[PDB]
Amino acid sequence: SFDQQGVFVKGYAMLGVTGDGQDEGESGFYRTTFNCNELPTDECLWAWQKNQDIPQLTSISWSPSSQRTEWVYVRLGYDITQYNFFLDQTEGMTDAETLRQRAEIRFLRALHYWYFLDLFGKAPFKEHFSNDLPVEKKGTELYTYIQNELNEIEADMYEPRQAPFGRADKAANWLLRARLYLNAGVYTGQTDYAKAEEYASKVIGSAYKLCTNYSELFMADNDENENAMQEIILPIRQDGVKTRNYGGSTYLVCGTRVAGMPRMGTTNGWSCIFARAAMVQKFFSNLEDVPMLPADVEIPTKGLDTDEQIDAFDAEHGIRTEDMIKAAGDDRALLYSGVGGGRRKIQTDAISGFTDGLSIVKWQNYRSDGKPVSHATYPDTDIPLFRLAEAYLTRAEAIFRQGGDATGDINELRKRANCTRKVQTVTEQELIDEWAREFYLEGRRRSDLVRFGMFTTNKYLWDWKGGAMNGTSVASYYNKYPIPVSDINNNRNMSQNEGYK
Ligand SMILES: [Ca+2]
Numbered sequence: 390s391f392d393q394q395g396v397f398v399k400g401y402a403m404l405g406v407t408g409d410g411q412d413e414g415e416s417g418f419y420r421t422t423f424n425c426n427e428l429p430t431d432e433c434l435w436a437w438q439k440n441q442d443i444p445q446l447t448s449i450s451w452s453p454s455s456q457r458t459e460w461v462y463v464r465l466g467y468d469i470t471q472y473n474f475f476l477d478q479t480e481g482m483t484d485a486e487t488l489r490q491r492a493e494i495r496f497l498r499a500l501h502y503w504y505f506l507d508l509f510g511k512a513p514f515k516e517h518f519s520n521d522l523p524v525e526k527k528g529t530e531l532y533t534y535i536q537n538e539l540n541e542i543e544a545d546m547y548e549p550r551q552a553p554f555g556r557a558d559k560a561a562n563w564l565l566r567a568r569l570y571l572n573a574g575v576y577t578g579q580t581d582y583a584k585a586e587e588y589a590s591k592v593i594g595s596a597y598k599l600c601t602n603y604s605e606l607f608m609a610d611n612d613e614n615e616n617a618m619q620e621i622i623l624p625i626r627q628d629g630v631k632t633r634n635y636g637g638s639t640y641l642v643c644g645t646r647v648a649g650m651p652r653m654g655t656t657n658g659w660s661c662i663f664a665r666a667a668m669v670q671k672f673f674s675n676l677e678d679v680p681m682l683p684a685d686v687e688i689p690t691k692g693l694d695t696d697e698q699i700d701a702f703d704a705e706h707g708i709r710t711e712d713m714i715k716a717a718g719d720d721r722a723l724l725y726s727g728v729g730g731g732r733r734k735i736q737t738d739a740i741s742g743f744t745d746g747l748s749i750v751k752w753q754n755y756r757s758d759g760k761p762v763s764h765a766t767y768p769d770t771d772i773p774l775f776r777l778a779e780a781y782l783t784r785a786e787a788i789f790r791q792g793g794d795a796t797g798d799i800n801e802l803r804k805r806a807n808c809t810r811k812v813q814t815v816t817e818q819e820l821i822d823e824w825a826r827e828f829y830l831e832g833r834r835r836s837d838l839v840r841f842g843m844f845t846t847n848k849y850l851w852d853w854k855g856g857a858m859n860g861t862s863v864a865s866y867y868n869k870y871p872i873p874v875s876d877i878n879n880n881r882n883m884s885q886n887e888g889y890k
Contacts, residue, residue: 403471664749
């Protein structure tokens with residue numbers, strides 16, 4: 390029989406865990422969406438280019454036969470079929486909890502449609518669980534639908550911070566709408582920054598507040614530490630012993646580490662992704678200012694097995710991550726150029742391995758309170774999918790776009806990060822750079838780059854963009870992923886996006 394509670398729980402679980410030619414957890418909502426919004430950007434690089442479809446995602450040169458693209462497409466659609474099932478099975482129910490559940494499920498469905506809209510510009514549309522092929526709902530119509538959904542369900546959702554931690558409240562609703570309004574120009578051709586500002590303000594005016602220590606937002610106890618919880622509007626709950634190797638944070642932590650690094654937080658460093666030189670430049674405009682071990686200084690083959698030994702050596706050469714942060718004058722510069730794991734490069738002439746770029750240690754499987762985590766390999770770290778910081782950056786950009794003064798909102802975030810440099814005047818470049826500094830490796834980069842018209846164009850060239858070591862542009866039709874050829878062949882209702890063949 391229909392287990393309403395079980396299905397509801399699964400609705401949320403789909404955001405952070407999975408149930409070939411696809412490794413464990415590869416079909417995950419988070420990993421697939423994260424990769425499509427990160428791997429082709431200036432924030433990071435996949436170290437093993439021999440992997441299928443990686444060169445394509447890395448260089449922005451994929452085709453309709455893209456495996457990675459099919460993965461995210463199939464996942465988004467599948468999740469929605471489940472949300473539709475729950476809604477069809479609870480239709481007519483009037484009890485208080487079910488009203489909240491239905492609103493929340495519609496919210497999650499709306500979020501999924503936003504991903505479709507943002508990534509493909511359209512989506513295989515269906516509102517009920519049936520065998521009928523989905524119909525194509527294009528950009529503007531899709532945009533309008535999502536905004537209507539969020540508007541209609543707001544009243545039945547929990548007030549800000551009143552829902553059980555892990556569930557969406559009215560503030561999550563407002564934030565997503567603010568994101569939609571901010572990107573209204575891209576999706577509909579008509580901007581709506583006035584509304585972006587309005588809804589961003591609703592979120593800022595809520596009970597949510599900014600965490601006083603940036604790093605704590607991405608630590609193992611971010612579901613218990615109030616300093617972090619007060620800012621996390623929508624957390625994707627993760628638990629080492631339960632989520633295990635199939636979660637989103639498994640990738641964020643294990644994927645960015647390699648044996649030898651101090652405080653790995655895991656016994657298994659996948660050494661999958663590292664920072665592109667352009668990412669490091671977001672904290673160091675002049676890359677020569679980045680703390681680095683001199684080429685003439687050798688790295689001992691012995692005496693560097695413990696974190697203590699590694700830290701002492703890094704300290705001697707000023708390359709501990711805490712030294713990186715001090716040099717950057719920004720708490721958010723959670724990068725590693727130390728000797729743990731081997732000699733690092735900031736930029737490379739050929740993507741040959743994990744050490745060809747600095748490591749990103751933003752995500753950690755250590756608790757701010759120092760207590761034990763649940764597992765030696767799989768992280769406990771929740772993914773703060775929605776953070777109050779997004780409201781500040783969204784409002785800043787909206788105000789800037791309208792000709793207003795956005796210094797206040799930008800400095801709210803820079804002050805939180807204890808930045809030595811405060812912004813005196815906001816510019817387009819400053820804004821997109823701040824989006825990177827605040828949200829790097831949180832799965833949204835590509836979307837912001839497209840809005841700023843920098844994803845495919847010459848307006849911004851980063852290392853390895855377009856397949857060129859120094860970066861080169863690509864066709865503008867790449868601002869949208871293609872509809873998987875498999876669905877083109879299976880659903881005659883769908884049409885391929887412009888440019889692809
Ligand atoms: Ca957790």
